[PDB]
Ligand binder design. Structure first.
Ligand code: NOJ
Ligand code: NOJ
Ligand code: MG
Ligand code: MG
Ligand code: MG
Ligand code: MG
Ligand code: MG
Ligand code: MG
Lengths: 781, 781, 215
């Protein structure tokens, strides 16, 4: 069985650089506390005991209320008068740092307005190892660079708004199956331990860890360790994960909380790098552990100062307001127990925090539309003589937009997946609604919407008469505690839901101008219809949130040229992506064993390795205009030689082998600063090229920079940079980026550091992972 | 708030009388044990941690395995190759002590064959305060005497078969709403404590406690304390309930276990009279409590000896075999964790324990059929030209007989309610099947079954052609953790399910020979159709178990004359019964307060008090013959005057004020032996009457003896005795019974004893609570 | 049993097709009834009937425990004036109705002694499951009328040795049988022209001519 080596002691904050101010204030505060008050900060109050999804204990003596931790990565969960933003996968499809930032800011503002201290997001774990992973849509992309950059931008947005962000789930939670034993038992599996993700040191560094490094370096205040095990040690008590990788190598200065009820070795977890136990036994044991000397004073002191450092870093001291909503009821008032009797208190103030956020939600919606096919289908005018609209995915949730708890259904148009990664729609504009509005405001031609996928007679009837037929199909997934139609979080197949395929086939048989719109959490198998000549255009629109219908028609009717690029591969078969989900226990009653044998070869890397042609490759997307690439240039920057980190920490302040050692510790070679050794981010080359709009309308292009690292075990190409640029007809721009040392390095387990290998590297600039228009050598030096 | 006075110390065993052999052996065994081993007997192993619904810790040092505790009151829950017996309410409808005993024996045999040590049943709580109480069907009758008698017979049957019986639930668990806070929260209620049943001392003694007294006197080995509070103290740590009423007044010698996760004050519960914590912290705390002196050594010794006494009393030492099934899977084999790695062990031996138990199931089915109306409808011959069968309740569960987990649905014929009070059908004979068999083996007339309650066109079609139309309707309920169609355990109304009333109305409109069969957990409202002249007969058949169809047709086609009497009242309205369920919290976030303000006036007592005429009164049932009552005679027996119990207990042996007092204790005036002061069971009068069969077929009569206690706050009549008697045409019998002192006494709170008041008492013998054919004074002495 | 006019449905056990070629059942003995009668009159072992083709979980649950699993599938057709599920008299395909194929596959995956009973108006395509080793027997019972259940169990339980022979061919594909039904007009608004170009080569004559091996 795979084994996770120990690493102790648990690193304490250094509070260097951009954390110095926050460290100073945290020390000043924690210095004043008793042991009990310190432990209060690390202790969850219990499941559903207060107002927020999680809360810490209070310190009333100083007028410090418990921290409020609230879902989700795409909005304020449970609360009323909030916005429902597009999912993370949509953000990925924008390839737009700026939009990612603005979404973070808007979300952060909403959390702030409700009195939330910590937003439980964003997500880089799952990364997206499997196409059928249940929660991938909450994250960004299987690509570590695209995910990492947008993760970082999102975090900066949330935290600039004055709310602590939380990078989750750390790490290796690439599927929902067997994430928690209790949950697995509920689905009829006999296991007593969570699945072990078995991941080697190189795969972690070059794939799954990379975006979390970006999150650390972006100044993220907190981390959440995952339900699963890594190398047969639960994440929340995995010393290699938290102590070595996170707090030494990546030099994370913030605090680590557990996922809710995530299994850890109790007090032992604190020694292994856990700082906060959620949702809440731990408190009194940690107290006793300190008193009897199993847990050092310096450790609890560091747990407290990490929590308070995050608090001060984002300016909670300035922006905190009372929690003015309740997660567990919409009632205005409720009862609370007191020392004697009960108090009737106000619990929901109905504070409207939505502001103008509908604008950015509509914008990201439109920006996340990916045009996959266009044989003269798009754009539409609104002066079509007869528009047919087809599919339940065009219509309303008959139970109300928020009629399914945690969005745990596929009623009507899909604009959000299910589970904890949700928020309530203040309203939801359907495609049916937006399209009828478009028509009735313009040409006022005929329009009919058949939103029952079983009504194939009517679809035939209407499609036979249509100038254009707009077909809507979806595929849903989410968190493992919800099972929809045999999908236990993870998708049981890559098929369109509710007979979407038959809808497409029926409509295309009767209308030679059929447009297909896919709202899917990830890829589906489209091989049987995508190349149908009656299908004149195909778009993926993902999970667009409250403005779905409006953001879509903006694109379909040509107000916005589609400029999204698919953030994952569209393969011919499920086998194209690699091995199935592990959905059958393979270690008897023990932890299922999930070997990440493919290494870095997930999504497009896999397709590239096996020389398999995807239907639509990673980074592919069409436009209403054309773009031309020319004149690549590589400028060596003659960076200083990489220096491994050296020296030692200071001794652990007070305000298992090594677990209680508070003496100065050696700095790891690849460590030294948040996100790793600073030399890793030295700029090595400047690469530039000219992009021109050679067509007849304004549009966005996503130029992409790929690197061939050149080794026998390296992917043919890996994404290293990208931007989204608006170009008017005949407009040119110089696209210029830099490659860092990290960008051209490989992880070396032997030396425990990033190395630039001797193999010749090649840089490519193109419009997709396969459309590599330009290339040049990276000259060694 | 209602208050529960303390009563300490927790009484230790006497081990006199029927318990002497058991106590001696229990002492000998426990004398050999360490503290840890003693505590192990009191500790559950944890939810789903072994094979049985509950298991105690083991004493491997003496090769003594953990006890196996298994549901249910009507069979062996979860296990394969077992029988599904008729529900307790059907037993009540038989009014047949012998049948109650034989059912207990058959159930005990099946538990025994599976290796079960404790059968978690039978049920006298709920008694049946509300007609819409979800779990009433698990018990017997709202009448305490009918329930007490049949409860005792059931217990004797189980324990004679060599299994420990468990009287549950003690006490006041008369509805499912708010029984457990976690469950209430799941239904959207904000409470942190279970409902409090607020019951006065007199009401407890004269109603709810009465059948439990019978259980004690019958020698039941164990009790289960309930989820709810009584006078704002959880049953499982209610010292008044457990120490005073159960273990002092009723002098119970066996052990008390908690309901599964029933709240109690931990170590405090032990001092208040709890002996066993299920399903299982307690072990550690109890060990610590003994070492530090907070729990006396004599208490833990008493806990252990009570458990072992129950074990020896029924002869578990003789009859114990290994547990040969698994509650949690039907798989033959399963992996188990070892010291090193894992083992693959046999978990299910598929031991067939059904024997010939199908016979007693068919018999009790037939005996529990109550004929409520017959204007020339029944019996049938099987030579009818055209038989129509109508209603989903005639047909099959389309998901298989065991297709709904815990029977949590109303698919097809209703033969069992839902929740823990269940067992898997080995097969299920439906009315549809049995009726078609009857016809096709006899006259071979036409027969059609319309088993879709929505297919009213077809019902008209068939009914208008039929010689006879047999209509099937049901109403279901169960434990609160299952919600079927908005019925949160408790019934949301007293309507027939699935449009049953419309089925009846449709068929009766088209067929002037309509027979209605009701399979209901309790009463439903029948005011709109019972008196329809086209309805020529009505039967209630309840929940008959696996032989439903066969037991029914035996009655319908005249092989068995119906002899059951309804064990509850059929009122015109819900309001007829009294006040609604408490289904809305009335103490803010605290324990809802459920005041039993009606006192002893439930079911027929309420109807009698308020002069509400029932449609069908308690104790009412028809026959295929007729019976005549004559010649009542009362013989005073000149019993010894009642002596209040006095004297002391032994000092507590070793092997809150007064909680640690192990000194001799005063015997309570109404205590002194199991079931109460033995003088209470002195026979005061002998009463006889003559019953004659004046009709033309053999049949059973259930003569009933009622007493008027004569006070202004006494019920007009209370049941005190009954029998079921077979009489051939023209045959007479002298029915002779005795009234005990208890039978003619009232509970006096001031003196804490049963008293015979000076109010004149009358005895009645008749065929129902309303059909009081004979009466005589009870002359005082 | 007679709940659908002219038997114009596929509710429950199929013992008669639809249209004018019908009569009213005086009663209908189902396989469910006959099999339960057989067991409860003999060994009195366990018996359960899952008769909802969508209840696949329950089918796995029960098939897992069974000594023998007896699976019932059907396919219906009739006169043109009745349309059932898009079958305008003629069958729109040769598939088992109501997901019968998925019933077979589910049961066979959980029980290595699965018996399949087919009540079909004619051949269906069985290529995907007939050769499944967990399917230990296959019978065609057709449309047996009022005694369906009883006539079946007489054979299943060995009172009568089966001696019937299939009166039509079971092919691998629909194409095996030759050209499709003419289901769209080919003479404008006038009489559709249905040319019997295959001549005498229908059913087994066709298979033999083109050297196609029947199942
Ligand atoms: O709801 C709280 C918590 N539940 C568990 C989920 O895995 C996590 O993402 C979420 O934040
Ligand atoms: O299933 C065990 C236990 N659960 C709770 C029920 O109230 C009780 O009757 C049953 O015995
Ligand atoms: Mg609250
Ligand atoms: Mg804003
Ligand atoms: Mg550091
Ligand atoms: Mg087990
Ligand atoms: Mg027997
Ligand atoms: Mg005593």
């Amino acid at each position: 069985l795979a084994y996770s080596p120990p690493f102790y002691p648990s690193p304490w904050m250094d509070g260097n650089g951009e954390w110095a101010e926050a460290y100073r204030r945290a020390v000043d505060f924690v210095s004043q506390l008793t042991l009990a008050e310190k432990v209060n900060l690390t202790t969850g109050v219990g499941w559903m005991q207060e107002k927020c999804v999680g809360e810490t204990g209070s310190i009333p003596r100083l007028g410090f209320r418990g921290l409020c931790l609230q879902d989700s990565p795409l909005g304020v969960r449970f609360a009323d008068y909030v916005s429902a933003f597009p999912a993370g996968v949509n953000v990925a499809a924008t390839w737009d740092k700026n939009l990612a930032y603005l979404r973070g800011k808007a979300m952060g503002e909403e959390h702030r307005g409700k009195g939330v201290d910590v937003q439980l997001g964003p997500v880089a774990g799952p990364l997206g190892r499997h196409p059928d992973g249940g929660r991938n849509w909450e994250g960004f992309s299987p690509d570590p660079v695209l995910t990492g950059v947008l993760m970082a931008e999102t975090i900066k947005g949330i935290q600039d708004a004055g709310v602590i962000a939380c990078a989750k789930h750390f790490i290796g939670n690439e599927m929902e199956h067997f994430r928690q034993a209790s949950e697995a038992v509920g689905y009829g599996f006999d296991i007593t331990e969570s699945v072990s993700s078995n991941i080697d040191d190189k795969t972690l560094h070059e794939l799954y860890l990379w975006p979390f490094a970006d999150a650390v370096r972006a100044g993220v205040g907190s981390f959440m360790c995952s339900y699963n095990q890594v190398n047969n040690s639960y994440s929340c008590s995995n010393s290699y994960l938290l102590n070595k990788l996170l707090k030494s190598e990546l030099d994370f200065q913030g605090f680590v909380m557990s996922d809710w009820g995530a299994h850890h070795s109790g007090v032992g977890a604190a020694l292994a790098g856990l700082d906060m136990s959620m949702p809440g036994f731990w408190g009194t044991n940690l107290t006793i552990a300190v008193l009897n000397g199993t847990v050092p004073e310096w450790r609890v002191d560091d747990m407290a100062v990490r929590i308070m450092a995050a608090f001060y870093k984002v300016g909670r001291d300035r922006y905190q307001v009372p929690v003015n909503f309740d997660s567990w009821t919409k009632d205005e008032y409720g009862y609370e127990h007191a020392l004697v009797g009960q108090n009737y208190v106000k619990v929901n103030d109905k504070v409207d925090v939505r502001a103008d956020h509908a604008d950015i939600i509509r914008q990201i919606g439109s920006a996340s539309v990916v045009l996959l096919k266009n044989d003269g289908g798009l754009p539409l005018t609104g002066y079509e003589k007869f528009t047919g609209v087809f599919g339940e995915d065009a219509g309303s949730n008959r139970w109300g937009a928020d009629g399914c708890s945690d969005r745990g259904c596929d009623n009507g148009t899909l604009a959000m997946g299910w589970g904890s990664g949700t928020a309530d729609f203040p309203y939801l504009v359907t495609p049916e609604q937006a399209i009828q509005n478009e028509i009735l405001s313009k040409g006022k031609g005929l329009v009919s919407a058949v939103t029952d996928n079983g009504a194939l007679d009517q679809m035939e009837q209407v499609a036979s008469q249509a100038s254009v037929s707009i077909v809507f199909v979806n595929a849903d997934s989410g968190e493992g505690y919800i099972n929809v139609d045999g999908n236990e979080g993870d998708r049981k197949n890559l098929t369109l839901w509710k007979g979407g395929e038959e809808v497409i086939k029926t409509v295309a048989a009767n209308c030679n101008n059929t447009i297909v719109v896919m709202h899917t959490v990830g890829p589906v198998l489209i091989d049987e219809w995508y190349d149908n000549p009656n299908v004149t255009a195909i778009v993926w629109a993902g999970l667009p949130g409250q403005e779905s219908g409006n953001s879509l028609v903006d694109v379909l009717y040509g107000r916005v040229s589609p400029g999204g690029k698919t953030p994952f591969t569209w393969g011919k078969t499920r086998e194209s992506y690699g091995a199935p989900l592990l959905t059958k226990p393979n270690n008897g009653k023990g932890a299922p064993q999930d070997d990440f044998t493919e290494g870095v070869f997930i999504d497009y890397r896999r397709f590239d390795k096996y020389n398999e042609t995807p239907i639509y490759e990673f980074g592919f997307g069409l436009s209403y205009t054309t773009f031309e690439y020319s004149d690549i240039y590589v400028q060596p920057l003659n960076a200083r030689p990489y220096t491994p980190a050296s020296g030692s920490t200071k001794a652990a302040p007070t305000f298992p082998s090594g677990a209680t050692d508070g003496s100065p510790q050696p700095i790891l070679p690849a460590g030294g600063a948040p996100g790793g050794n600073p030399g890793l981010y030295d700029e090595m080359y400047r690469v530039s090229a000219i992009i021109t709009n050679t067509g007849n309308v304004v549009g966005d292009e996503v130029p992409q920079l790929y690197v061939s690292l050149g080794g026998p075990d390296d992917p043919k190409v890996v994404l290293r940079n990208f931007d989204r640029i608006t170009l008017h007809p005949g407009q040119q721009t110089m696209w210029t980026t830099t490659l860092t040392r990290r960008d051209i390095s490989n992880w070396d387990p032997a030396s425990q550091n990033w190395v630039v290998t001797k193999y010749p590297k090649t840089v490519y600039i193109g419009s997709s992972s396969r459309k590599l228009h330009l290339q040049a050598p990276l000259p060694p030096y």
